Design a protein around this ligand. Structure first.
Ligand SMILES: *[C@@H]1O[C@H](CO)[C@@H](O[C@@H]2O[C@H](CO)[C@@H](O[C@@H]3O[C@H](CO)[C@@H](O)[C@H](O)[C@@H]3O)[C@H](O)[C@H]2NC(C)=O)[C@H](O)[C@H]1NC(C)=O
Ligand SMILES: *[C@@H]1O[C@H](CO)[C@@H](O[C@@H]2O[C@H](CO)[C@@H](O)[C@H](O)[C@H]2NC(C)=O)[C@H](O)[C@H]1NC(C)=O
Ligand SMILES: *[C@@H]1O[C@H](CO)[C@@H](O)[C@H](O)[C@H]1NC(C)=O
Ligand SMILES: *[C@@H]1O[C@H](CO)[C@@H](O)[C@H](O)[C@H]1NC(C)=O
Ligand SMILES: [Ca+2]
Ligand SMILES: [Ca+2]
Ligand SMILES: [Ca+2]
Ligand SMILES: [Ca+2]
Ligand SMILES: [Zn+2]
Ligand SMILES: [Zn+2]
Length: 705
């Protein structure tokens, strides 16, 4: 043991050669977790004239020597490069001095350097790095420091009228390291004893209480939390924004720029993701701008490994979504991450912003994500700009609702494993008759942690006239709460697929929407037959439906359907009528009124489910172009049937676009697989040129024998 001083008496006389400007006292004690009696420290107050520093006697050091101490510079978060404290050593009895730990980033080959692979700041302690005291430890193993050396904490020389930042040090230990360096979770005493930090225990502070397996900061909440151990140089701001609403964390000061997380349980973590903007101006960022380094530590910050360097470039000055998979080596019960932008002097050439930090996920193979939105769990719903947990449109409890004024509206799920048995099933609503606007909400998937998003359902006509997104969540058909069930296509299969509901900008405030009763997974069977919802691996049937998978009607289905369309379409015959209304515009199609589809949005007609086991035919009268004739083949109405409650459809007839300029009669013999105990029909027009364009009419439907 070479040197120990707690300053709790006064200073130990033999320890120190000099301490100009230093006086025993208290500095910034009220955050400190240490005992009150221990708060006595060596303080260097701003107004002291002359040198501000403290120098040790000459000591004999070796590769196993550490310097360990606690420091507070400035008792604030007002970050500054002015008058930092430098920890230095001298090999010539104080004639010359050098930083004990150099700044290590990318070293020149023209010079002698001790830096190796690990990127780290120097033993320089800047004002406004943190309000709290902190422990620093420097190990000599890498420093080629052996023999007689003296050390100093040095700030500067200050004439009268100077006002450098006040600082203080405490609990200085210089001597042999402790075993395992106390795993970076304790203070070493004499190399023989570890004094463990809270939540760490045992001889070497190896054993940890469980750490959280998830971190979120959107910077809309508190800036003092258990989430970050350091937030040096970052302030909440709306400047240099990335997202359309809310604060970001903004680095626009000098000194240290370093954001350090608490220790996390990342043993099953999949990802770190965040938004970042490197540079805030219209031109190209200054080429001297130093990169933001993302690093991790397994040992309480004793050593750091690189995840990614993010360089300033001609394109970096636009907000960007960033996501990385958590590598195996970073996955432990106790891993912290940091974002650090190096600088040799505490000066920076550009600001930067970070926002919406999420760390977590789960690599253990989970195949199910479900929610009724009784709560909004951040671990399941990663991003939801514009979205609020609240009731709307007579929802079952709360829903996730996009109603407030916003420039961005989307919601992203966490990742799940998707396989051949996977399906997506949600309730969705648009504006609930608040607006009559025609709009759609995109449903998308990513297999790369949100780096790219692709439409879940592709434009693919069963006629193969058009094939390559298909608008599904549309505001007329889904005006009020409506269920959709989609088998997940092969291209979505992976061990980590996530989903996004996206309202592309620009959109109007009144074009609102919501989701509820979400199930994405491979449970239940038959996707509940179109007549129920999967809840915790069990089908919950709609009213009037029963059986294990909701395939059994409580009351016998009709065996025929007939409609002359001389009265308003009835829910006894029709489940859906969008874009169609009874009129005489077509003349007689069969007779009197016809159901005329000329709406500017969806044009869709769906029957109730029918028992067609013994039925023989479907027939109807049909006309195109009562107003404007269809201009191409993809505008042909498709007649399809479903035997699974509208989940999947089978083409029966393409009602060819350039036919039926005069009313015609269609008579089709039902195929075997359309003759089931529960089957529905739909007429839908995949494309049209809008209101009163490429219109069609139907009359005298008969599905019978
Ligand atoms: C699906 O629909 C078929 C009809 O195509 C149903 O089969 C029919 O079931 C009814 C019972 O409600 C039987 O009706 C009875 O017919 C006798 C004939 O003399 C009459 O005396 C009774 O008063 C009554 O009307 C009918 O025989 C039978 N037809 C056939 C071809 O079997 C069937 O029940 C339906 N399936 C499901 C799953 O509900
Ligand atoms: C990570 O995901 C896995 C899912 O594979 C979770 O482990 C399951 O947890 C539930 C508890 O409700 C059990 O019913 C399963 O039997 C567990 N399976 C396995 C393989 O252990 C795990 O809980 C998730 N981690 C966290 C912390 O949420
Ligand atoms: C550490 O060594 C110093 C030598 O000055 C001694 O005063 C102190 O009691 C020792 N501490 C422990 C806990 O061994
Ligand atoms: C970015 O801008 C600088 C100066 O405007 C230019 O010289 C440089 O080549 C640009 N970078 C790239 C790769 O386009
Ligand atoms: Ca003390
Ligand atoms: Ca934010
Ligand atoms: Ca709900
Ligand atoms: Ca009619
Ligand atoms: Zn590097
Ligand atoms: Zn999109």
């Amino acid at each position: 043991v070479l040197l120990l001083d707690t300053f709790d008496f006064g200073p130990r006389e033999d320890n120190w050669f000099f301490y100009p400007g230093g006086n025993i006292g208290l500095y910034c004690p009220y955050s400190s977790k240490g005992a009150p009696e221990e708060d006595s420290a060596m303080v260097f107050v701003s107004n002291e004239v002359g040198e501000h520093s403290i120098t040790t006697r000459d000591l004999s050091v070796n590769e196993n020597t550490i310097i360990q101490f606690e420091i507070n510079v400035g008792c604030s978060t007002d970050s500054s490069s002015a008058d930092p404290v430098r920890l230095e050593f001298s090999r010539d009895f104080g004639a010359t001095w050098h930083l004990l730990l150099p700044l290590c980033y990318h070293s020149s080959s023209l010079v002698s350097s001790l830096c190796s692979t690990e990127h780290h700041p120097s033993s320089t302690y800047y004002a406004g790095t943190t309000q709290g005291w902190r422990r620093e430890v420097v190990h000599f193993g890498k420093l080629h420091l052996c023999g007689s050396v003296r050390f100093r904490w040095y700030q500067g020389f200050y004439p009268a009228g100077s006002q450098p930042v006040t600082w203080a040090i405490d609990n200085v230990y210089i001597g042999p390291q402790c075993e395992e360096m106390c795993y970076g979770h304790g203070s070493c005493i004499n190399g023989t004893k570890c004094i463990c930090d809270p939540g760490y225990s045992g001889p070497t502070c190896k054993i940890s209480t469980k750490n959280p397996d998830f971190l979120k900061d959107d910077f809309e909440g508190q800036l003092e939390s258990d989430r970050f151990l350091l937030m040096s140089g970052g302030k909440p701001s709306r400047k240099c924004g990335i997202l359309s609403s809310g604060n970001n964390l903004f680095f626009n000061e000098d000194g240290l720029r370093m954001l350090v997380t608490r220790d996390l349980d990342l043993s099953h973590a999949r990802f770190v993701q965040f938004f970042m903007r490197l540079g805030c101006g219209k031109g190209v960022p200054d080429p001297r701008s130093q990169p933001v380094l993302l690093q991790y530590s397994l040992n309480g910050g004793l050593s750091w490994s690189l995840l990614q360097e993010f360089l300033f470039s001609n394109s970096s000055n636009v907000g960007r979504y960033i996501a990385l998979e958590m590598p195996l080596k970073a996955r432990s019960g106790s891993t912290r991450l940091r974002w650090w932008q190096p600088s040799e002097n505490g000066h920076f050439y550009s600001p930067w912003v970070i926002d919406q930090i999420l760390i977590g996920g789960n690599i253990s193979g989970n195949t199910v994500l479900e929610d009724d939105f009784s709560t909004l769990d951040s671990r399941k719903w990663l991003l939801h700009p514009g979205g609020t947990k609240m009731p709307v449109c007579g929802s079952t409890g709360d829903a996730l609702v996009f109603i407030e004024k916003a420039s961005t509206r989307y919601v992203v799920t966490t990742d799940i494993a998707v396989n051949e048995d996977s399906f997506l099933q949600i309730d969705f609503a648009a504006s609930c008759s608040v607006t009559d606007s025609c709009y759609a909400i995109e449903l998308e998937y990513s297999v790369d942690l949100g780096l790219s998003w692709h439409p879940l359902v592709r434009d693919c006509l069963p006629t193969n006239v058009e094939c390559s997104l298909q608008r599904i969540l549309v505001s007329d058909t889904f005006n009020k709460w409506t269920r959709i069930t989609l088998p997940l296509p092969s291209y979505t299969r992976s061990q980590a697929t996530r989903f996004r509901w996206h309202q592309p900008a620009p959109f109007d405030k009144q074009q609102t929407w919501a989701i509820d009763n979400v199930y994405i997974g491979d449970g239940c069977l038959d996707m509940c037959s179109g007549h129920g919802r999967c809840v915790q691996g069990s089908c919950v049937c709609d009213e009037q439906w029963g059986g294990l998978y909701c395939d059994e009607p409580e009351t016998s289905l009709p065996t025929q359907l007939k409609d002359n369309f001389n009265r308003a379409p009835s829910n006894q015959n029709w489940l859906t009528v969008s874009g169609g209304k009874l009129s005489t515009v077509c003349g007689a199609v069969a007779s009197g009124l016809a159901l005329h589809f000329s709406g500017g949005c969806s044009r869709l007609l769906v029957t109730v489910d029918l028992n067609l086991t013994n039925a023989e035919f479907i027939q109807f009268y049909f006309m195109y172009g009562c107003l404007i004739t269809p201009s191409n083949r993809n505008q042909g109405v498709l007649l399809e049937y479903s035997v699974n409650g509208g989940i999947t459809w089978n083409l029966l007839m393409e009602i060819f676009y350039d036919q039926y300029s005069k009313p015609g009669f269609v008579n089709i013999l039902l195929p075997p697989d359309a003759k089931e105990i529960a089957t529905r029909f739909r007429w839908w027009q995949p494309r049209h040129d809008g209101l009163d364009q490429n219109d069609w009419a139907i009359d005298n439907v008969l599905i019978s024998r």
